[PDB]
């Protein structure tokens, strides 16, 4: 049948400040985190560990990729499941990569 | 209890190109994505084959990941999959310095000469 | 929905060292791996401890991630844990330029100078 849980995404209404950490409070109000799952929330942990995850939950997993160039402020984007990050080396930066048993190395050199 | 769902991986033979977007088609045919979970598969109706309120399985977790690529100048992208518990090492040599810092889930990789 | 499974985290007790892989071993102590889900732990029958067709939990989701490492030439690796909703910044300074563009979830980070 249907399986559901009460996990919210950052950016959703009814976020409870006293129920979360300051880190999550900061994510709640940032655009870059909007729509990523809020996995933490604490009455002491609201959605218990032993709660079924849903496929909709998986669609909301990710991390935030940012780039800074000098003083210029950070630009941020979400890396969700099956998104791609390309590291591209132009002149005169050489970017090479190896991959052994789940360990991926991106090398940078002149 | 044996919990299952109908989620496929990219590269699976019976993915239907007609019913899905160009973005998904592009992932479906790349070896780089092969075996990653296909979360965004649609039917004729342009609705998701597997609805949000479906049990996720441990098998599903084993197919989560993102694609990591490097491209030098004009040459074509070399790609790998970063799956759960994989490691990505950014290494500086040959005149390039790479350093890192971490604080409260905020990680920084810094590149210098 | 109340649900459980037998998945443990790297760093947890009762890890059968001789029945598991070298990599898992290589991971179960490294601090950067601690608390990350041990997805592929084997049992005494030399099969996966938790089969593919088992419900995943929110507790599992809280343990998903990957390891981000850096190496400055000769020095040792510095490693840190990247979990869901962590941020990773790529910063360029004297005098590497690090710029980024994104389109349809493909993110390009470009290194110049």
Author numbering:
A (entry chain B): 53 to 96, 100 to 165
B (entry chain A), C (entry chain C): 53 to 165
Copied sentences from the primary study:
In a subset of nontypeable strains, the major nonpilus adhesin is a protein called Hia. Hia contains two homologous binding domains, called HiaBD1 and HiaBD2, that interact with the same host cell receptor. In particular, the Hia passenger domain consists of repeats of structurally similar domains, including five structurally identical Trp-ring domains strung together by two IsNeck domains and two KG domains.
